[PDB]
Every structure is written in structure tokens, then in C-alpha cells.
Amino acid sequence: KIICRDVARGYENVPIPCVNGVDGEPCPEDYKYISENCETSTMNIDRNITHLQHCTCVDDCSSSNCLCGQLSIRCWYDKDGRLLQEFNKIEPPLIFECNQACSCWRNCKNRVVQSGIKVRLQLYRTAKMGWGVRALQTIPQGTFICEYVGELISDAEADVREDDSYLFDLDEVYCIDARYYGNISRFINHLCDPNIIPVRVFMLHQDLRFPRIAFFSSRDIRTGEELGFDYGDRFWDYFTCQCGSEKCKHSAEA
Ligand SMILES: Nc1ncnc2c1ncn2[C@@H]1O[C@H](CSCC[C@H](N)C(=O)O)[C@@H](O)[C@H]1O
Ligand SMILES: [Zn+2]
Ligand SMILES: [Zn+2]
Ligand SMILES: [Zn+2]
Ligand SMILES: [Zn+2]
């Protein structure tokens, strides 16, 4: 049987199994699973602790006076760590989580992304799109899913790389390249009917060149459902969409 118990090798809060019920391809081995972003050449990230804006809260950061919440416009997390229904899912705001400069505790309410993966996912072989990721549980709208993790590289570097299949733009542009080093998010396919959205988030640094990319569910997700986001019209403008949705706008057909 083609199967891996945990492609993350214990690095995430939960296992991420792999299965293939479709064809003869073994679990992918042509990359290195990493749970946090890496660098090869240095990006010279502004890690200066004194450049962090931070809050003075000594409660759990649930009040509207939390500076970090104000930097985000408001804290968009409800009491359970889910995005509020009012969250702009078309044009998400930048999220500034609490950090090591804040007065609050590490368990405050403004630290969802930095607390890591909580939902049960599976790497699996799709019918027509290669590998994909699907839910092994129901997941309410607004739930943090996973971060787009990979190798941070410059625009000029991305421009000369052989394989652009695993690039996520941090638009002056830097990219996250998950080709050689990446997490579960490298396997998330494009869907014309998407159920997750990427959100830019700041945690341990606030170097605006380098937002981290957090996927949140955009609606309730059912068990077994493939996870997917909108790669965008510019990406689509070699191969055509196989999402198979009645709404597909990028197939060879339509
Ligand atoms: N909607 C879609 N239709 C056809 N291919 C898709 C797709 N979304 C993603 N892909 C494929 O997946 C690549 C992005 S990386 C996503 C994981 C990939 N399916 C894998 O097996 O490793 C794209 O280059 C394309 O090959
Ligand atoms: Zn606060
Ligand atoms: Zn806080
Ligand atoms: Zn704070
Ligand atoms: Zn489609």
C-alpha cells in the first residue's frame, strides 16, 4: 500500500498522512518537508526586536484597545480563534499577531497562526490534478488551516528558477518557493470554487517585505473535501484547469 503516517515527521501539532488510491506514484520524495519558512541565501530580514510594534495588554488581548488588534484594524479572531464573519475575504487586511515584545502572555487571543496546525488533513492523490490536500474532519468557516511554508527568495531569483510551480508571490516582490523545501501547502491545488483564502500575517518580525501566508477556510468544509484556493487570473494567463467544478473558468473548455 502507498502510505505515509506523517509526511511532517512530527513537526506539526498533528500528523499529516499521505495516501494514493488512484495510481502507482509513491508518496512524494522530491522535496524536503519543513514546518517553518527557510532561507538558503539570506534575505536580510529586519529581526530588530525594537522595530516591533507591540501591545501593553495584561489581559488576554480580547479588548478593542489592544494595539496589535488596532494594527490589524481590529482583532479578527473570535474567542475560538476563528475569523469573524465580517472579515473581508476578497481583500483581507494584514494581520498583526502578538509577539515577543508585547506585555501579554503567550496564550493570549491574538496568536492563532503562530500556534500552528490544528485540523486533520491528508495528502492524497487526486484523479486529474496530481497530489492534493483534503480535510479528514469538518472544519467551520474562518478556521486557520496551514501556512504556505517554503524557501524565501528574491524576485530576481524566482525569475531564473527552472520550476515556478510552487511559487507564492509576496507582492517590489519577494516569493515563497516551495519547490525544494516546503510544507503541506505546496500540495494545495487551484479551485475555481475555492474553500480557503490566503491572508498576510506578521508574528515574530514586522518586516513588511516578508508577510507570512496563512490559509483560513472561507466557508464550512466537509470531511473528504479537497482544499483549494484561487491561484488568480494572472497565474492562468502548458495546462488547463481540472477542478471539474460547474463554475470552472479555466478549463480547456470554458
Ligand atoms: N486546478 C488545477 N488544474 C490542473 N492542475 C492543477 C490545478 N491546480 C494545481 N495544479 C497542478 O499542481 C501544480 C501546483 S502545485 C499543487 C500540487 C500538485 N498537484 C502536485 O502534484 O505536486 C500546478 O503546476 C499544476 O500542475
Ligand atoms: Zn494586546
Ligand atoms: Zn496578546
Ligand atoms: Zn500584542
Ligand atoms: Zn477550474
Residue numbers in the entry: 920 to 1090, 1095 to 1160, 1165 to 1181
What's the publication's text?
HKMTs catalyze the transfer of a methyl group from the co-factor S-adenosyl-L-methionine (SAM) to a substrate lysine and, with the exception of DOT1L, are all organized around a canonical SET domain. Methylation of H3K9 in humans relies mostly on members of the Suv39 family, namely EHMT1/GLP, EHMT2/G9a, SUV39H1, SUV39H2, SETDB1 and SETDB2, as well as then non-Suv39 enzymes PRDM2 and ASH1L.
GLP residues that contribute to substrate binding are conserved in G9a, and it is reasonable to assume that the peptide binding mode observed in GLP holds for G9a. First, a conserved tyrosine residue of the post-SET domain (Y1211 in GLP and Y1154 in G9a) is a major component of the lysine binding channel while its hydroxyl group participates in catalysis. Second, the hydroxyl group of GLP's Y1124 (Y1067 in G9a) hydrogen-bonds to the methyl-accepting nitrogen, thereby inhibiting an orientation of the dimethyl-amine that would favor transfer of a methyl from SAM, as was previously shown for SETD7 (for review). Similarly, it was shown that the F1152Y G9a mutant can only mono-methylate H3K9. Our structures show that this residue is perfectly superimposed with GLP's F1209 (0.1 Å RMSD), which, if mutated to Tyr, would hydrogen-bond with the ε-amine nitrogen of H3K9 and impair the alignment of the accepting amine's lone pair with the methyl-sulfur bond of SAM. Unlike I-SET, Post-SET is absent from the PRDM2 structure, which lacks co-crystallized SAM or SAH. As previously observed with other HKMTs (for review), the co-factor contributes to the formation of a hydrophobic, mostly aromatic cluster (composed of Post-SET Y1211/Y1154/Y261, F1215/F1158, W1216/W1159/L298, F1223/F1166/T285 and SET H1170/H1113/H220 in GLP/G9a/SUV39H2) necessary for partial folding of the Post-SET domain.
